[PDB]
Design an enzyme around this catalytic site. Sequence first.
Site, PDB file in Angstrom:
ATOM      1  N   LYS A   1     110.936  66.804 111.361  1.00 11.08           N
ATOM      2  CA  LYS A   1     111.214  66.325 110.012  1.00 11.08           C
ATOM      3  C   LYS A   1     112.031  67.340 109.228  1.00 11.08           C
ATOM      4  O   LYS A   1     112.956  66.972 108.496  1.00 11.08           O
ATOM      5  CB  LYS A   1     109.907  66.009 109.288  1.00 11.08           C
TER       6      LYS A   1
ATOM      7  N   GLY B   1      92.475  72.740  84.950  1.00 14.20           N
ATOM      8  CA  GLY B   1      92.249  71.308  84.965  1.00 14.20           C
ATOM      9  C   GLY B   1      90.857  70.902  84.541  1.00 14.20           C
ATOM     10  O   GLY B   1      90.638  69.738  84.191  1.00 14.20           O
ATOM     11  N   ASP B   2      89.925  71.845  84.529  1.00 18.61           N
ATOM     12  CA  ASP B   2      88.529  71.585  84.200  1.00 18.61           C
ATOM     13  C   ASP B   2      87.855  72.941  84.055  1.00 18.61           C
ATOM     14  O   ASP B   2      88.460  73.983  84.323  1.00 18.61           O
ATOM     15  CB  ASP B   2      87.851  70.737  85.273  1.00 18.61           C
ATOM     16  N   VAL B   3      86.590  72.930  83.656  1.00 20.22           N
ATOM     17  CA  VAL B   3      85.835  74.160  83.459  1.00 20.22           C
ATOM     18  C   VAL B   3      84.590  74.085  84.329  1.00 20.22           C
ATOM     19  O   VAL B   3      83.893  73.062  84.337  1.00 20.22           O
ATOM     20  CB  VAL B   3      85.474  74.388  81.980  1.00 20.22           C
TER      21      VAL B   3
ATOM     22  N   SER C   1      89.352  77.809  88.689  1.00 14.44           N
ATOM     23  CA  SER C   1      90.662  78.383  88.393  1.00 14.44           C
ATOM     24  C   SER C   1      90.593  79.417  87.277  1.00 14.44           C
ATOM     25  O   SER C   1      91.428  80.329  87.220  1.00 14.44           O
ATOM     26  CB  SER C   1      91.640  77.266  88.018  1.00 14.44           C
ATOM     27  N   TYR C   2      89.616  79.300  86.379  1.00 18.32           N
ATOM     28  CA  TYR C   2      89.500  80.280  85.302  1.00 18.32           C
ATOM     29  C   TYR C   2      89.266  81.678  85.862  1.00 18.32           C
ATOM     30  O   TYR C   2      89.977  82.635  85.517  1.00 18.32           O
ATOM     31  CB  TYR C   2      88.368  79.878  84.359  1.00 18.32           C
ATOM     32  N   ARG C   3      88.267  81.813  86.736  1.00 17.03           N
ATOM     33  CA  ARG C   3      87.960  83.108  87.330  1.00 17.03           C
ATOM     34  C   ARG C   3      89.091  83.594  88.224  1.00 17.03           C
ATOM     35  O   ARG C   3      89.263  84.805  88.386  1.00 17.03           O
ATOM     36  CB  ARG C   3      86.649  83.025  88.122  1.00 17.03           C
ATOM     37  N   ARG C   4      89.860  82.686  88.824  1.00 17.48           N
ATOM     38  CA  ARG C   4      91.020  83.113  89.599  1.00 17.48           C
ATOM     39  C   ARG C   4      92.206  83.511  88.723  1.00 17.48           C
ATOM     40  O   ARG C   4      93.243  83.904  89.265  1.00 17.48           O
ATOM     41  CB  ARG C   4      91.455  82.013  90.574  1.00 17.48           C
TER      42      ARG C   4
HETATM   43  O1  LIG Z   1      89.629  75.392  91.503  1.00 25.87           O
HETATM   44  C1  LIG Z   1      89.192  74.637  90.591  1.00 25.87           C
HETATM   45  O2  LIG Z   1      88.040  74.809  90.134  1.00 25.87           O
HETATM   46  C2  LIG Z   1      90.027  73.472  90.065  1.00 25.87           C
HETATM   47  O3  LIG Z   1      91.070  73.180  90.718  1.00 25.87           O
HETATM   48  O4  LIG Z   1      89.662  72.812  89.029  1.00 25.87           O
HETATM   49 MG   LIG Z   2      87.491  73.629  88.506  1.00 27.45          MG
HETATM   50 NA    NA Z   3      84.898  71.166  88.283  1.00 28.85          NA
END
Ligand SMILES: O=C([O-])C(=O)[O-]
Ligand SMILES: [Mg+2]
Ligand code: NA
Length: 320
Positions: free
Chosen positions: A62, A176-178, A167-170
Site C-alpha cells: 500500500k 479529552g476527559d479527566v 493524559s493529564y498525568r502524561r
Molecule cells: O489517556 C487517556 O486517559 C485519554 O485518552 O483520555
Molecule cells: Mg482519560
Molecule cells: Na476516562
Amino acid sequence: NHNLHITEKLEVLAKAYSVQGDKWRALGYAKAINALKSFHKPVTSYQEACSIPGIGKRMAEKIIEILESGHLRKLDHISESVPVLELFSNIWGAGTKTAQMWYQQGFRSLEDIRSQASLTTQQAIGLKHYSDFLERMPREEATEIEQTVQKAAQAFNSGLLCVACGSYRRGKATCGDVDVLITHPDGRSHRGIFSRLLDSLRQEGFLTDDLVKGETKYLGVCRLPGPGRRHRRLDIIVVPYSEFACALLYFTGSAHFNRSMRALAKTKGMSLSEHALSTAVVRNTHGAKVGPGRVLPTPTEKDVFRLLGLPYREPAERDW
DNA sequence: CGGCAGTACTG
DNA sequence: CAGTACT
DNA sequence: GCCG
Ligand SMILES: O=C([O-])C(=O)[O-]
Ligand SMILES: [Mg+2]
Ligand code: NA
Ligand code: NA
Ligand code: NA
Ligand code: NA
C-alpha cells in the site's frame, strides 16, 4: 511525522475497519500507522517499508502505491455506510454492533436516533452530550476538575490521596476527559466512600449525569460553575493502597503503552493488571490464564518496571 | 495457526 | 453471556 | 492488518 502522506490515507482505512467491527485488522493498521509516525525519515522503498516493525508485505504494498500513485485505490471502495457508522458509534455507550444494528434498521442521522431509536440509559446521556464529548478541554480546566474532586473527598477524610491520571498525568496540553484515582495510605479508609463523595459532588451541581456506578469505578459527567462551561467526562477509581502503584500505572496509560507492557509481562511468565503484577502465572496454549501466580510486591511504579526488566519511564514518556 | 491486555460494568 | 468501556 |  515524516510520512503524513502515507498515514493520513491509512488512518481512513483503519477507521473504516474499526467502525465496521473488524477489530484485529484495524489494530494492525493502528500499529503500522504509529510505526510510520515514529520513523525518522520518509519511507522511500518497499524493502525499506518492510524494514519497520509493524509493516508487512500487504502494508508495504500500500505504501508503494501511495508514493507512485499519490493515492490508495482501496479508499475508493469504502462502503457508504462508514460515515454513518462513525456518527452513531461516537455516541457514548454505542459501539460497532449497535451502530450496525441502527444502520440495518434504516437510521441515517442523529435525528433518526433521537426520534426512533431505543436507547439505553447510557446512550441517551451520550446523545445529549454528543458534541461536548467530542471536544477536548484545556489542561487548566482538567486541573479545576481534579481539584473539585480532591476537595470533596478531603472534606470527608483529609488523608485521602487524589491524583489526576490519564493524559493529564502524561502532560498533555488538552484532555479529552479527566481520570481521578483515589486511595488512602492506611489501607482501609478508602472503603464505602463513593456514596458520600458522589452525593457531595451532586449537591454542588458539579456531577450532572452518571454513566457507570460500580463498587470501584465511577464514570460520569461533570460541569464547572459559571458561564461558558461545557459538560466533561469524569472517571473516578477508588483502590486499596496495596494496589496503588499498579492502579496508577494502569490509569496513567497510555492505552497502547499498557497493552505493550502487559504483552511484555506475559512473555516473561507474568501478568500485569490494575490490581497487581503477578509471577509464576500458568496459562494454557491460547495465552489464557488457567492458574494464578503470586502477586509481586510493587510499592511504586518503578518497582513494576524493575520487575519487568525495564528502565523507568516518566508518565510523559508513556504517551504511545 | 492463531494471538493480538486485562479488567469493570450493564442488563 | 455480549457489548461497551477504561488506560 | 502483523508477527511468532
Ligand atoms: O489517556 C487517556 O486517559 C485519554 O485518552 O483520555
Ligand atoms: Mg482519560
Ligand atoms: Na476516562
Ligand atoms: Na517488519
Ligand atoms: Na460509542
Ligand atoms: Na422509520
